[PDB]
Design a protein around this ligand. Structure first.
Ligand code: 6BJ
Length: 306
């Protein structure tokens, strides 16, 4: 009953995570996808929150939603294939990243998060387990279930149950991410939850000898307990540390459109439909996140590889 519809469009491969995640192949294009499987009667608002955000967000550093399928018991989300693994696993594998490798990764995180804020959203659960590498070793932001329109990464105001601005909470989380990338351990860490809570509230952390003066200053600018003292996203885009070795601000605007359609992909898609080109373009432009949406976006991913 639950897998009947999904099997009309996808050939299932193995479970990789237990939401349960399955790898699969889109039958029509032959493209690999990841499928997130969530049970309705085992948080339903968290599923609807993520779906609503992903239907509205489309960006080179956000893991793309292709197709949404629903049954009485399950909701399936067909998503962009990211075989490079979690950033969390990558940092551990490397112990810690150099300042230069941290900047490569961090500029991509800044790009995705600045775009999310530009769209009127705040992620609210930024952490290395929520950033994946695709086949090109480019980062993709995942899990928009807690977004607004993990304790080690949470801003002090957010833990205290106080009112907060989502953008300020994201800037603090990005500061914790920045520290983890360059150190390979958390700035606030404890086995006891209350002792961790105390450490976050105090905002004091050890500064390893390998951190450069510029890294230390950026960390200080992001890790401010008072949210009004944290750096704004606008100032993060062209921060001196961010610009070092690059000399251009972070490109945060989306390169992945809703309006423009790719002519080659429209042609490839149209051969599978008993409709003219203009009818197919108008249907694609409705972005229903049905099989048509998945087919078009997967053909765009196939084109990108070549
Ligand atoms: O290791 C992977 N493949 C190679 C492989 C594995 C086993 C056997 C043979 N070859 C793989 C591929 C894709 C993924 N993705 C998870 C999400 C994802 C997106 C949104 N929310 C949660 C997860 C998107 N891609 C992970 C892992």
């Amino acid at each position: 009953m639950d897998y009947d519809e999904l099997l009309k469009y996808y050939e299932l491969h193995e479970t990789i995570g237990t939401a349960k995640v399955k790898l699969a192949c889109h039958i029509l294009t032959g493209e690999m996808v990841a499928i997130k499987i969530m049970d309705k009667n085992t948080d339903l608002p968290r599923i609807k929150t993520e779906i609503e955000a992903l239907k509205n967000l489309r960006h080179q550093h956000i893991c793309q939603l292709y197709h949404v399928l629903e049954t009485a018991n399950k909701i399936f989300m067909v998503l962009e294939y990211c075989p490079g693994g979690e950033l969390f696993d990558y940092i551990i594998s490397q112990d810690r990243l150099s300042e230069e490798e941290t900047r490569v990764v961090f500029r991509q995180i800044v790009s995705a998060v600045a775009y999310v804020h530009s769209q009127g959203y705040a992620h609210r659960d930024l952490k290395p387990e929520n950033l994946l590498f695709d086949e090109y070793h480019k980062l993709k932001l995942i899990d928009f279930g807690l977004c607004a329109k993990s304790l080690a990464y949470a801003a002090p105001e957010l833990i205290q149950g106080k009112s907060y601005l989502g953008s300020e909470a994201d800037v603090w989380s990005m500061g914790i991410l920045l520290y983890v990338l360059m150190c390979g351990f958390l700035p606030f860490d404890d086995d006891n939850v209350m002792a961790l809570y105390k450490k976050i509230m105090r905002g004091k952390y050890d500064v390893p000898k390998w951190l450069s003066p510029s890294s230390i200053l950026l960390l200080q600018q992001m890790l401010q307990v008072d949210p009004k003292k944290r750096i704004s996203m606008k100032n993060l885009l062209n921060h001196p540390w961010i610009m070092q070795d690059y000399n251009y601000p972070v490109e945060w605007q989306s390169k992945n459109p809703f309006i423009h359609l790719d002519d080659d992909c429209v042609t490839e898609l149209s051969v599978h439909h008993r409709n003219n080109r203009q009818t197919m373009e108008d249907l694609i432009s409705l972005w229903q996140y049905d099989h048509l949406t998945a087919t078009y976006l997967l053909l765009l991913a196939k084109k990108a590889r070549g």
